[PDB]
């Protein structure tokens, strides 16, 4: 239900006494939160709408040269000068050319020569500032139960119904309480100022395409620019980055414009993240949050209901959702209305012992009609298993085999934890932390390592990371001394940082 | 204003705060209430279920002065290094603000 088929779904379980759990909501990812006696609630960060942007230094990328002019002065007769040099919309450059009696002088030598050129930018790009107090994170919430595959497990959430909730997260309202009808309320305690460090990220505007341009990259662009606080003719500081004053044969100085720098800055933007803009607000498609989930008010609906009588029907044949969980759909045929489906996993079904755990806690049919659909989710153990979704002789079972093992599960969890550490950095220790002396000491020493690594190297590309990793590998394979752990921690910390892409 | 009582509810978060180049956060609030001389319950707290005061307060003993409907106030708090919340109320109608 809105998070069951996404490949970046992780499972967080267990709380500190059923009170709170700490989680990190990725922007492309989803988090499925399950508990013991509380219903399974899916979280999905959908958007990041940044409003109220003010402009910064806006660069030009397509220039033009108007009617140019040039004039020389005789040698030992002063320096050349024009009245059109007294405007800021004219670029110029002084040079020394040959001058003779065929050139009209009366003294042979290297006379001064000034060539003016009226600058006129046609199309310019714009950088905008991102304030950290203007982030608006939208969080979709959906609990597992009483849903179909149609308008209940899709994006139909533009209303106020049960089992679906949306909340906006500002820094002015960092906590939220989504109202789930019958299920209680999930308490969010998000920390939106600890996003993707938005004090050093700008917002580019070029050709109706937008990026999350880093600030230190944006402050060092060699292009003509004005300060952005102008609604007329711009001043265009540093006009000499797109014009070229080329002496042909020391007889005539021609000035030509350079080409449009659109493709030269699209190739220079090899590290920004593309965003969109739906007006004056900037919708992002990336980032991460930091939320604590108060789960004390989340209650389970449908525990007092009775069982179903009989007649379950197997429609929408179940498949594996790329993690080991099996989305199982049923069509219950009966007129009980509010009944409870006795769904369970079972190995060696003559004993009917529940062995595999269940994701959708307390599955409930709501509709009082004859044909009633339901969308479940079950996780089998590694080996042969049956899906018993009925009671009595009219149960329907399903032969299911989750391919894998326990140590393969732990190896895949180690790979997922390494990718989660390579994406988040310091915040990856608070993804399933319930509060302890190891998830706050490990996060502290990883914060020390991140502050000592992002300040030290901090600027390596994807290829240069592997290029210095080969050097650190060769320095780890030799120089047998006490400093061999420095050549292996900074080897793996760059190699897994560069290879997990 | 040590003899004043605490506030009841209904604060308003105007003038979204910032850092004054030293780690201090100057926070403006608008107490929507006619209680008069009440004392503002401001504290800096991580782990919002506990509300443990971790950061010290610069403007000691903040006091609402005006007895009208919307009495303004300007405070200053020193959060610790890391993540924190500016909890400037009591009860259930309190408003908070995350600060890093």
């Amino acid at each position, epitope marked *: 239900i809105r998070c069951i088929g996404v490949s970046n779904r992780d499972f967080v379980e267990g709380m500190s006494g059923g009170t709170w759990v700490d989680v990190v909501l990725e922007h492309g990812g989803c988090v499925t939160v399950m508990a013991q006696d509380k219903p399974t609630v899916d979280i999905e960060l959908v958007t990041t709408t940044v409003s*109220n*942007m*003010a402009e910064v230094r806006s660069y030009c990328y397509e220039a033009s040269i108007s009617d140019m002019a040039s004039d020389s002065r005789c040698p030992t007769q002063g320096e050349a000068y024009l009245d059109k040099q007294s405007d800021t919309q004219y670029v110029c450059k002084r040079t020394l050319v040959d001058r003779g009696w065929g050139n009209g002088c009366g003294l042979f030598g290297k006379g001064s020569l000034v060539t003016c050129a009226k600058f006129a930018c046609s199309k310019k790009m714009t950088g905008k500032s991102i*304030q950290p107090e*203007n982030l608006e994170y939208r969080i979709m919430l959906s609990v597992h139960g009483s849903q179909h595959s149609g308008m209940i497990v899709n994006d139909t959430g533009h209303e106020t119904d049960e089992n679906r909730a949306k909340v906006e997260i500002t820094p002015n309202s960092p906590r939220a309480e989504a109202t789930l009808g019958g299920f209680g309320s999930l308490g969010l305690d998000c920390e939106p100022r600890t996003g993707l460090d938005f004090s050093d990220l700008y917002y580019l505007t070029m050709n109706n395409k937008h990026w999350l341009v880093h600030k230190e990259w944006f402050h060092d662009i060699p292009l003509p620019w004005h300060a952005g606080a102008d*609604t007329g003719t711009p001043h265009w500081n540093n006009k000499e980055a797109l014009v070229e004053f080329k002496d042909a044969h020391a007889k005539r100085q021609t000035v030509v414009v350079l080409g449009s720098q659109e493709g030269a800055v699209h190739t220079a933007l090899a590290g920004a993240l593309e965003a969109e803009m739906d007006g004056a607000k900037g919708r992002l498609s990336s980032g991460h949050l930091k939320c604590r989930l108060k789960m004390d008010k989340l209650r389970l609906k449908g525990v007092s209901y009775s069982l179903c009588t009989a007649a379950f029907t197997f429609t929408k044949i179940p498949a594996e959702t790329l993690h080991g969980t099996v989305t199982v759909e049923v069509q219950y045929a009966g007129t009980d209305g509010p009944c409870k489906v006795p769904a369970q996993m079972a190995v060696d079904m003559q004993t009917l012992t529940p062995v595999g755990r269940l994701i959708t806690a307390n599955p409930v049919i709501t509709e009082s009609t004859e044909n009633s659909k339901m969308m479940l989710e079950l996780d089998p153990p590694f080996g042969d298993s049956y899906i018993v979704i009925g009671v009595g002789e009219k149960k329907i079972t399903h032969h299911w085999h989750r391919s894998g093992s326990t140590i393969g599960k732990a190896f895949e969890a180690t790979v997922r934890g390494a990718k989660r550490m390579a994406v988040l950095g310091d915040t990856a220790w608070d993804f399933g932390s319930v509060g302890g002396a190891l998830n706050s000491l490990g996060k502290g020493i990883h914060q020390i390592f991140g502050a000592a690594f992002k300040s030290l190297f901090g600027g390596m590309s994807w290829f240069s990371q592997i290029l210095i990793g080969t050097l650190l590998m060769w320095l780890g394979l030799n120089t047998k001394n006490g400093s061999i752990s420095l050549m292996c921690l900074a080897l793996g910390g760059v190699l897994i940082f560069l290879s997990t892409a | 204003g040590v003899s004043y009582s605490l506030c009841t509810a209904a604060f308003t978060f*105007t*003038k*979204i705060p910032a850092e004054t180049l030293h780690g201090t956060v100057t926070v403006e609030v*608008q107490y929507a209430g006619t209680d008069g001389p009440c004392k503002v319950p401001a504290q800096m707290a991580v782990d919002m279920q506990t509300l443990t005061p971790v950061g010290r307060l610069i403007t000691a003993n903040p006091v609402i002065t005006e007895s*009208t*409907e*919307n009495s*303004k106030m300007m405070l200053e708090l020193d959060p610790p290094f890391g993540d924190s919340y500016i909890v400037i109320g009591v009860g259930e109608k309190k408003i908070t603000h995350h600060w890093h």
Partner: antibody
Amino acid sequence: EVQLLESGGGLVQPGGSLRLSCAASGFSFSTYSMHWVRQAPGKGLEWVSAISGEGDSAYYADSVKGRFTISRDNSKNTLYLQMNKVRAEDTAVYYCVGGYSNFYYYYTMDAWGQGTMVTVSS
Amino acid sequence: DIVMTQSPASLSLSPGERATLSCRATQSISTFLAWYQQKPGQAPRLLIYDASTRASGIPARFSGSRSGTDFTLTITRLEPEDFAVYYCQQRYNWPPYSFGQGTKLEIKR
């Protein structure tokens, strides 16, 4: 109390130059920044120009930039809005706004004058 | 480029009811707004400093609020000696501050 008297009345002929002299007295006007707000008949208010606490600095609006220059005498606490190149769009009621400024141009409590009937007729 | 627009400009209401006047902005002016009170033929006064606190000699029946770039007035009881023209003012960054347009208040007759 708040006493911002204005002077320099009459009419402004097209092509000349006059001075609107605000006789500001009753406060320490060496720190109070001074402003000038129009009042167009039938339309809203217009912001014209202002003088900062420091003597050298002075700003105007973009529609009246380079035409109306002001001067403050610190020994007199007065203003002189030089009405150079007056066109037909200056038919309004000028005022004098004075407020305290820690920075260049700011006020927390504003003061006002009584107005000056300045029209253009040929 | 920040033009203070007022919506609405006239409300045919009775003295004693409420009145909400809003001033808008284009860029991100956070809170620094100032309302004014101008009777025709008299000197203009203010209404509220930072849309929350009035001047010396102005009662607390007139207040404002902050909502993004819009600032709505909250008037408890309208008096017949209070219907005049009201303006807004910019006090963000560097001047010239931009005034609104002028909001008059009409009565039934």
